[PDB]
Each structure stands twice: as structure tokens, then as C-alpha cells.
Design an enzyme around this catalytic site. Structure first.
Site, short mmCIF file in Angstrom:
data_model
loop_
_atom_site.label_atom_id
_atom_site.label_comp_id
_atom_site.label_asym_id
_atom_site.label_seq_id
_atom_site.Cartn_x
_atom_site.Cartn_y
_atom_site.Cartn_z
N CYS B 43 0.86 -1.19 0.00
CA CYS B 43 0.00 0.00 0.00
C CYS B 43 0.89 1.24 0.00
O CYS B 43 2.01 1.22 0.52
CB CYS B 43 -0.90 -0.01 1.24
SG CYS B 43 -1.67 1.56 1.76
N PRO B 44 0.42 2.35 -0.59
CA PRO B 44 1.23 3.58 -0.63
C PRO B 44 1.90 3.94 0.70
O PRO B 44 3.02 4.44 0.73
CB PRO B 44 0.23 4.64 -1.07
CG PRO B 44 -0.65 3.88 -2.01
CD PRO B 44 -0.86 2.54 -1.30
N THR B 45 1.20 3.67 1.81
CA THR B 45 1.72 3.98 3.14
C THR B 45 3.04 3.26 3.47
O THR B 45 3.92 3.83 4.11
CB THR B 45 0.66 3.66 4.21
OG1 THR B 45 -0.53 4.41 3.94
CG2 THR B 45 1.17 4.02 5.60
N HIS B 64 1.14 -3.96 6.08
CA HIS B 64 -0.03 -3.96 6.97
C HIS B 64 -1.37 -4.43 6.36
O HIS B 64 -2.39 -4.39 7.04
CB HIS B 64 -0.23 -2.56 7.60
CG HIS B 64 -0.51 -1.48 6.61
ND1 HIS B 64 0.45 -0.97 5.75
CD2 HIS B 64 -1.66 -0.82 6.31
CE1 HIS B 64 -0.09 -0.06 4.97
NE2 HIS B 64 -1.37 0.06 5.29
N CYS B 175 -7.11 -3.37 4.63
CA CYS B 175 -6.88 -1.92 4.57
C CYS B 175 -7.62 -1.18 3.45
O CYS B 175 -8.59 -0.46 3.70
CB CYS B 175 -5.39 -1.57 4.44
SG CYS B 175 -5.10 0.25 4.39
N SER B 179 -11.43 0.70 3.80
CA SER B 179 -11.31 2.14 3.95
C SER B 179 -12.14 2.94 2.94
O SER B 179 -12.77 3.93 3.30
CB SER B 179 -9.84 2.55 3.89
OG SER B 179 -9.14 2.07 5.03
N1 LIG Z 1 -7.82 7.53 5.88
C1 LIG Z 1 -7.53 6.20 5.91
O1 LIG Z 1 -7.84 5.49 6.88
C2 LIG Z 1 -6.78 5.64 4.66
C3 LIG Z 1 -6.11 6.42 3.72
N2 LIG Z 1 -5.47 5.83 2.64
C4 LIG Z 1 -4.79 6.77 1.72
O2 LIG Z 1 -5.61 6.94 0.55
C5 LIG Z 1 -4.77 7.26 -0.61
C6 LIG Z 1 -5.03 6.42 -1.83
O3 LIG Z 1 -4.68 5.04 -1.77
P1 LIG Z 1 -4.59 4.13 -3.13
O4 LIG Z 1 -5.82 4.10 -3.94
O5 LIG Z 1 -4.22 2.77 -2.77
O6 LIG Z 1 -3.41 4.87 -3.91
P2 LIG Z 1 -2.98 5.09 -5.44
O7 LIG Z 1 -1.70 5.73 -5.58
O8 LIG Z 1 -3.09 3.81 -6.21
O9 LIG Z 1 -4.16 6.09 -5.90
C7 LIG Z 1 -4.02 7.48 -6.36
C8 LIG Z 1 -4.82 7.72 -7.64
O10 LIG Z 1 -5.19 9.15 -7.74
C9 LIG Z 1 -4.79 9.68 -8.99
N3 LIG Z 1 -4.41 11.12 -8.94
C10 LIG Z 1 -3.23 11.76 -8.57
N4 LIG Z 1 -3.30 13.12 -8.68
C11 LIG Z 1 -4.58 13.36 -9.14
C12 LIG Z 1 -5.29 14.56 -9.47
N5 LIG Z 1 -4.78 15.80 -9.39
N6 LIG Z 1 -6.58 14.43 -9.91
C13 LIG Z 1 -7.16 13.18 -10.02
N7 LIG Z 1 -6.59 12.02 -9.74
C14 LIG Z 1 -5.28 12.15 -9.30
C15 LIG Z 1 -3.67 8.77 -9.50
O11 LIG Z 1 -3.53 8.83 -10.92
C16 LIG Z 1 -4.08 7.40 -8.95
O12 LIG Z 1 -4.85 6.63 -9.86
C17 LIG Z 1 -3.32 7.25 -0.08
O13 LIG Z 1 -2.90 8.60 0.11
C18 LIG Z 1 -3.43 6.39 1.19
O14 LIG Z 1 -2.37 6.59 2.11
C19 LIG Z 1 -5.47 4.40 2.44
C20 LIG Z 1 -6.16 3.66 3.41
C21 LIG Z 1 -6.84 4.19 4.55
ZN LIG Z 2 -2.88 1.06 3.91
#
Ligand SMILES: NC(=O)C1=CN([C@@H]2O[C@H](COP(=O)(O)OP(=O)(O)OC[C@H]3O[C@@H](n4cnc5c(N)ncnc54)[C@H](O)[C@@H]3O)[C@@H](O)[C@H]2O)C=CC1
Ligand SMILES: [Zn+2]
Ligand SMILES: NC(=O)C1=CN([C@@H]2O[C@H](COP(=O)(O)OP(=O)(O)OC[C@H]3O[C@@H](n4cnc5c(N)ncnc54)[C@H](O)[C@@H]3O)[C@@H](O)[C@H]2O)C=CC1
Ligand SMILES: [Zn+2]
Ligand SMILES: [Zn+2]
Ligand SMILES: [Zn+2]
Lengths: 376, 373
Positions: B43-45, B64, B175, B179
Site C-alpha cells: 500500500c502507498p503507506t 499492513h 486496509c 477504507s
Molecule cells: N484515511 C484512511 O484510513 C486511509 C487512507 N489511505 C490513503 O488513501 C490514498 C489512496 O490510496 P490508493 O488508492 O491505494 O493509492 P494510489 O496511488 O493507487 O491512488 C491514487 C490515484 O489518484 C490519482 N491522482 C493523482 N493526482 C490526481 C489529481 N490531481 N486528480 C485526479 N486524480 C489524481 C492517480 O492517478 C491514482 O490513480 C493514499 O494517500 C493512502 O495513504 C489508504 C487507506 C486508509
Molecule cells: Zn494502507
């Protein structure tokens, strides 16, 4: 004075920014379709009016200011039947046409009648047909936020006023026009305070004090009052505050102090001051998981929120005229005062002739008052 | 209580990739369970940990998001036995603190650091570690540390699931899927017939679309700067798609015009300074709601006028789920086909090739890569 005729009366005009108000004689035209002409009985000065005289802010001139008042109907326009001469009324800046998507939803009190969403203080500057009812020394004068109460006679839209009890004391119910309603409702409708909770109110003027009244009526068990001017505490305590704090006399940030006293923070916070420091502290002092912050006053254009804070449970929202559906709720607040549900008297510190309006403005600018009643 | 010798991925210092090493895993103590990892994702984290700009602790065993089986349990444990299927997680529910008892939040008293949660739960309850390598004690990660053949976790950080669960797919419940799915259902509180907008189409954003649809939304707008992310979005429920890089007007202005005023609910699953600002702008006046999920920057700036005119803001933590009580239910929904997780897995690789899975993610070429043993 009589129907269909132009009236000549006293008023206070702002010819340009950063200047004091001048007493002039003006001509008030008769009401057109869907309009009502009122004789203003009593009015107060609100910081929003003064804010208009600030050179660093956006506004229009020349204009007739004032938006918190109460009065009596002189005449009504063609096709109007819900109002008649003799009725006692209270106008306001938040309209309720009852005929739009926004007016139908129980989730908001805004109305489709509003047009400017970036600068509401300059909206509703003329009547529907885009013309003015004011004239002085040949020149046409602007209206202010749909009210313009700094004149013996004014003209408003049917969507901007409500009829109230025939036996209401106009020299006090005028506070329902803006200040009292905004603070009282912010606590009850916008923040949604609940029985047994802990609250914190920043800023102890008319708005903040009305918010304390609201929190008590909603049943909070603890209320913390914050202000940099300690002379405002006694009046806050008489209305329900259980604790008081002066940021200026503390060693640590006031929010850190609040967090210690409550062992984690408060359930609800309301900012009735609006500075960069109060906005940040209002969020900081709430409990994680379910803490809620409601914005009421705002002297700055923006606020900065750390991302981890909302991720951990905190939320943010704000109020517009206390969240009250205006035309329907104002009459009910007036009835509550009759039944002694709350005392508007404690909000009044001064009384003066309309001619001395400039002195009332100085008093408020010096933080030596809450509200001053002006009469013609 | 024998000591197990296995392989695991360790980060020795900031600025360098993960190293496959042979370590020693100690037996579980009271209120603890030793798990045999069957499938784990990156995961990105986990990747942020090695970026010098971010705060972290070293040396550590990362990871995780996983699914697995019970190897052995500690003294006095009775709700778990060898052979049971389980899913661990970073959001605890110890059930012996004040927060767990409250129906107003899904947080727990087990947590301590509220400014940098990525460095919390770095050791066990008694403040010691269960990992050892070349005479050195190694740190745990967010209470899980899944990049290892075997790991040990606190009873407050896992739950037993259906005996017939496919561990190669339900690992996403650890995760990513939970989420995003929960952000729409529990945090934003999406309602039947509403209109929504989701920014970012990785695992989290796609799961948010799945959640919006299940809640009853009538319209779902998907936004991403990478057009190759669209086909999967439509397969899962998206009704309209937009790419900021191919529009002359700011994306928030295009959304406002296509909906005649904005959307009822927006969800930022990207977290950039630009997405956070747009997510707030594209909501309707009066009751518009913005929910923060992703977060690449530490702050966000909101105009005073917007909150006064009805817009509100909030954020999610593991989708708002009371972890121990809800994870088993999510596994049951999948068994009953309420939703389909197979579309979220785009690749598979042997554990030893973990570094190739990381590079795949940093090129925007994947959703989730499962690592097997
Ligand atoms: N609050 C919580 O409990 C949680 C938060 N997260 C967080 O959520 C985020 C996303 O996770 P993933 O989907 O797995 O990551 P990922 O990197 O695969 O997803 C990011 C996506 O957003 C796009 N993107 C980037 N800049 C953009 C813009 N200006 N406009 C539109 N789209 C844009 C990318 O092209 C990509 O497809 C991370 O920052 C992660 O740490 C993950 C799990 C739980
Ligand atoms: Zn995560
Ligand atoms: N949202 C809405 O619809 C409405 C908003 N308002 C606004 O609410 C605000 C309050 O109105 P009033 O009570 O009539 O004004 P006021 O001027 O009487 O109240 C300000 C109070 O805050 C205190 N203060 C200033 N800096 C402070 C700081 N750093 N920490 C703590 N206290 C501090 C002052 O000492 C004073 O007692 C104004 O900004 C007004 O424009 C008024 C009506 C409706
Ligand atoms: Zn006012
Ligand atoms: Zn309306
Ligand atoms: Zn707990």
C-alpha cells in the site's frame, strides 16, 4: 407620508469609505408590486455595518446602511394582501420565498433569491426591478443587504420580512433582526448542542452571549467562555457560563488549557470572534472522534486545517442567520420573549437619539458596549 | 512456544529499498496471536516509510494489508486456535478502554500518537519486540508487520473469519477496500437518489464507488489524471468520467456545470493540494459535504464564506468501522456476492520479488499486486 406619495424624512448616508455618517433629508418613493414600506421605530448598529466603512473591504457608495431593526407598516404595493397598515414587523437579510428548491429542504435556510456567493455583503443592493427607492440631492442612493434601517422610512421585499405580535415591545424585539437570532440559533440549529455536553464559546459580544443562552437552553452541563477583554465575563456568567479564560493572561495556548480542564476537549465549539487565532483554537480544543466546530464570526477570508485532524474525527461547519427559516421562525422567537423564555434586556447597554449615531459607532469600536438602541 | 526461523523484508535506514533477510520470530504472550501470512499487498503507506521527507523508525518490518491463518496462540487465549482463518488490521478495538464503548467513534485507547500515527504501535503491549535479526532487535509497523512468513499481533488487532474464505482475495479487507467502502457508507453517509464525485481511482477510490452504488446513489462521477483508470471505474458503477488534463476549465467548474449547481457528496481519494480544493468547490450550497480519505499534504485551506453558506468537511479512519465487529461481516457479504473483489487484483508475484511490485505501483500501472509464498 400618505399612500402613493413620496416621503421626505431624516436618514444617515455614507457618501464614501473610511468616513463618518452624515445626517441628511431624503425622499423615499412608494412601494411597487410585492414591496412594503415601513416606518422604522428602533434600530441598532452591528459590526457588519461598520465593516462596510473599512477601506480594505469591498462595498458600494453612496448607500444607506443598517439591517437590525423593528417597525410598523405605512403602506403596501399593488397586489399585496399578507400585510396592511398598522401591522408590527421585523425585516432581515436572509429571505424565504417559500418557492424554490433551497426553501423546500429541511437541511438549509438559504434561498434562491440570493445571487452573490463570494461577497454577500454587496448583494441585494437594489430592488427586484434593479432600481432604487432612495434619492438625495438629485443623486440615487444604494440599499444595504435588503434592509437599510438607518432611515425613518424604508422599503423591502415581501420575502424579507415577517408580521409579529400586536403587543410586542419594538424597542427590544428589534434585536431579533440579526444579532440575538444568529447566536441563539447557531447553538441550537447549526451546532446542534445536546443534553449533558461540554461547550466552548469564543467572543463575548451580543452574538457570543446569545450563543451561551442557546447552549444553556439546549441543556449543556458545562460552558467555557473565552475573551481577551475580561470585563465581558460577569455578563457571560449571569447568562450561563461556568468557566472563563483570558488568552492574554495565560502561559500556554488557550486551547491547550481547555484540553487539560476537560481531559481531552469539548464536544462543541462556536467561534463568535473570527480572528486567525480564534478559528485555529476553536478546532484544536474539540475532542477527537466526534468533536464539532461551528464558524459564526469571520474577519479573515480563510482558515487552515491540518489533514490528520479530520482523519481522526473532527468536523467543521458554519451558520447563516442562526440557521432559521426566517419568515416562519421570527414570529415564534417574539412569542418566546413574551413568555419570558430569555431576557433581551441584558443585551442593551445604551440608548441614544438617532442624531448621535456616530457616537454609538465609536462606543462599539472601543468595545465599551454590547448594543445601543437608536430611536427617531 | 518454539522460536520460528523464517524470511521477512526489513528496512534498515531511510533512502534505501527493502532487504529480504532471515529472522527469528518469538512465541506469543498473553493476549497475543502468532499468524502465518498467506497473502499480502503493498500500500502507498508502506512506501512513504522510506522517503526521507517523512517521519519513520528504523530498523523495521513493514507491511499492513494481509490475510492468513493461526499458527499458535498465547497463554489464556480462547477465541482463537491453530487453523482458524484471520485478518489483522491497524485500527484496534481492544474492548477494555473508554473509546471502544462509545458509538460515536471507531478510535481506541490503545492509540497514543495523534500527530504521526505511522510511528505508533511500533512495539507490543509490554513494550518489547518479537523480531530479531543478526543480534539486533527490530521494530513492528502499525501493529501488523505483514512482510514476513510469520508475525505476532495483539488480540485487539485481528478477527476470525469464515472457514471457506479465499485468502488470496479477502486480504484487501485488511486496509484498502474497507477504507474506501466505509468512507462512503459510514463517514460521508451517502443516501438513496443522491449524486456523488470521487477523486482518485486506485484501490481506495474504486471501493468508494462500490460503496456509493450500494448506498443507493443515482449518479457517480469519476475523476483521475490517468485515463487508463476509466475502464475499471465504469465496470464498477461510474456514470460519468473526467480527466483534468483534457479540460480547459478547472475540473470543479466542469462538474458544477454538468450538474447545474454541484454534487451532494464528494470524496477525495487522492489527497493533493489541488484535489482537496476541488473536492470542496464542486459540492452544492446549503448542504454540500466533503469527506477526506487520501492525504499527501499536511494541510488544507478553506474559505470562510463557503462554510457560512452551507458546505461542511469531515474525514475517515479505516472507513469508520468498529474493526473486530465488522470485518467478519464484510467477508460474509463477499461470500454472498454483494460485491466482487476479484476486479481489484491486477497482478501476482512471489514474495521475493516485492521490490518489482513496488516499482509497478510507482508507475501508475497497477491497482493491487498480491504477494504469495
Ligand atoms: N484515511 C484512511 O484510513 C486511509 C487512507 N489511505 C490513503 O488513501 C490514498 C489512496 O490510496 P490508493 O488508492 O491505494 O493509492 P494510489 O496511488 O493507487 O491512488 C491514487 C490515484 O489518484 C490519482 N491522482 C493523482 N493526482 C490526481 C489529481 N490531481 N486528480 C485526479 N486524480 C489524481 C492517480 O492517478 C491514482 O490513480 C493514499 O494517500 C493512502 O495513504 C489508504 C487507506 C486508509
Ligand atoms: Zn494502507
Ligand atoms: N454568520 C452570520 O450569519 C452572522 C455573523 N455575525 C458576525 O459575528 C461576529 C460577532 O458579532 P458581535 O457579537 O456583535 O461583535 P462584537 O464586536 O461585539 O464581538 C467581538 C468579541 O470578540 C472578542 N475578541 C476579539 N479578538 C479575540 C480573540 N483573539 N480571542 C477572544 N476573543 C476575542 C472581543 O473582545 C469582543 O468581546 C461579527 O464578526 C459579525 O459580523 C453577526 C451576525 C450573523
Ligand atoms: Zn448583523
Ligand atoms: Zn426561496
Ligand atoms: Zn479500546
Amino acid at each position: 407620508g400618505t399612500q402613493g406619495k413620496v416621503i421626505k424624512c431624516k436618514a444617515a448616508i455614507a457618501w464614501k469609505t473610511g468616513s463618518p455618517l452624515c445626517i441628511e433629508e431624503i425622499e423615499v418613493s412608494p412601494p411597487k408590486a410585492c414591496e412594503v414600506r415601513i416606518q422604522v421605530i428602533a434600530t441598532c448598529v452591528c459590526p457588519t455595518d461598520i465593516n462596510a466603512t473599512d477601506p480594505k473591504k469591498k462595498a458600494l457608495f453612496p448607500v444607506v446602511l443598517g439591517h437590525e431593526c423593528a417597525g410598523i407598516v405605512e403602506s403596501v404595493g399593488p397586489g399585496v394582501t399578507n400585510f396592511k397598515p398598522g401591522d408590527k414587523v421585523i425585516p432581515f437579510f436572509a429571505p424565504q420565498c417559500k418557492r424554490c428548491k433551497l426553501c423546500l429542504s429541511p437541511l438549509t435556510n438559504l434561498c434562491g433569491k440570493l445571487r452573490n456567493f463570494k461577497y454577500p455583503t454587496i448583494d441585494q443592493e437594489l430592488m427586484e426591478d434593479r432600481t432604487s427607492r432612495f434619492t438625495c440631492k438629485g443623486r440615487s442612493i444604494y440599499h444595504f443587504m435588503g434592509v437599510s434601517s438607518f432611515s425613518q422610512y424604508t422599503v423591502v421585499s415581501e420575502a424579507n420580512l415577517a408580521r409579529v405580535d400586536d403587543e410586542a415591545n419594538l424597542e427590544r424585539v428589534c434585536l431579533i433582526g440579526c444579532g440575538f437570532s444568529s447566536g441563539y440559533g447557531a447553538a441550537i440549529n447549526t451546532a446542534k448542542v445536546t443534553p449533558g455536553s461540554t461547550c466552548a464559546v469564543f467572543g463575548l459580544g451580543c452574538v457570543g452571549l446569545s450563543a451561551i443562552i442557546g447552549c444553556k437552553i439546549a441543556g449543556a452541563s458545562r460552558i467555557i467562555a473565552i475573551d481577551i477583554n475580561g470585563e465581558k465575563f460577569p455578563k457571560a456568567k449571569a447568562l450561563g457560563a461556568t468557566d472563563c479564560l483570558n488568552p492574554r493572561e495565560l502561559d500556554k495556548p488557550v486551547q491547550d488549557v481547555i484540553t487539560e480542564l476537560t481531559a481531552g476537549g469539548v464536544d462543541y465549539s462556536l467561534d463568535c470572534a473570527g480572528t486567525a487565532q480564534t478559528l485555529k483554537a476553536a478546532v484544536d480544543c474539540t475532542v477527537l472522534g466526534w468533536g464539532s466546530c461551528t464558524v459564526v464570526g469571520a474577519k479573515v477570508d480563510e482558515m487552515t486545517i491540518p489533514t490528520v485532524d479530520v482523519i481522526l474525527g473532527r468536523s467543521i461547519n458554519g451558520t447563516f442567520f442562526g440557521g432559521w427559516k426566517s419568515v416562519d421562525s421570527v414570529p415564534n422567537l417574539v412569542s418566546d420573549y413574551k413568555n419570558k423564555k430569555f431576557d433581551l434586556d441584558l443585551l442593551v447597554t445604551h440608548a441614544l437619539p438617532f442624531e448621535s449615531i456616530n457616537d454609538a459607532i465609536d462606543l462599539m469600536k472601543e468595545g465599551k458596549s454590547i448594543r445601543t438602541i437608536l430611536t427617531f
